[PDB]
């Protein structure tokens, strides 16, 4: 009925806005536009909280946005993303990564491993060796478990190992994944309609 049809239209539009915001968040992440990312993050969060129902596809979209936000805050060790205050931002990203309904291909495994490694490295670069060991215990598996344990034990913050499995390396692999999400939803309604309006003026 009238009110019901309006409510359905609102649900449809909310779904469109979620997709569009995800796309915008991915681009800001890719381009390194930190302030735009923060603002788009707040918008996406508001739209998500306003949803009264979700489809599996939307849940995946939500996870993707949550994942990127945790990654963007990877070095902000004082940021609490989970109810359990002990969980660091990268550990939170790791949990989300392991929940997303996606294929565990090579890129997936590469990202997973790099996040596990950097979750420990960011703590060590802050001189927080006790916290690094605590992160290790919570996370640990991979073939580098023993090496990480040793690196932590010896407080070897700038071990060559980290030079290879660096934060930048982690970021570039995730940006590769973002390019995939980007191409996958660059055709969602809102973005497509807006692009059409922009072109319809040229």
């Amino acid at each position: 009925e009238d009110a019901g049809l309006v409510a359905e239209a609102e649900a449809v539009a909310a779904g469109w806005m979620l997709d569009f915001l995800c796309l915008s968040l991915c681009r800001a992440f890719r381009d390194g536009r930190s302030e735009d990312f923060r603002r788009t993050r707040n918008s996406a969060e508001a739209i998500i909280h306003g949803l009264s129902s979700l489809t599996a596809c939307q849940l995946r979209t939500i996870y993707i946005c949550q994942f990127l936000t945790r990654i963007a805050a990877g070095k902000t060790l004082d940021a609490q993303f989970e109810n359990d205050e002990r969980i660091t931002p990268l550990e939170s990203a790791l949990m989300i990564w392991g929940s997303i309904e996606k294929e565990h291909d090579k890129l997936h495994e590469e990202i997973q491993n790099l996040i596990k490694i950097q979750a420990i490295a960011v703590c060590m670069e802050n001189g927080n060796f006790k916290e690094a060991e605590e992160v290790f215990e919570r996370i640990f598996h991979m073939p580098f478990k023993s090496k990480l344990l040793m690196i932590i034990s010896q407080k070897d913050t700038f071990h060559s190992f980290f030079q290879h499995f660096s934060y930048n390396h982690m970021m570039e692999k995730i940006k590769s994944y973002v390019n995939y999400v980007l191409s996958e939803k660059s055709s969602t309604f809102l973005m497509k309609a807006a692009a059409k309006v922009v072109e319809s003026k040229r």
Binding site: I62, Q80, N128
Partner: peptide, 13 residues
């Protein structure tokens, strides 16, 4: 809790 994108608060470091 919640589908939070932003932090829930500050963490004890």
């Amino acid at each position: 809790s919640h589908f939070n994108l932003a932090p829930l608060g500050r963490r004890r470091v």
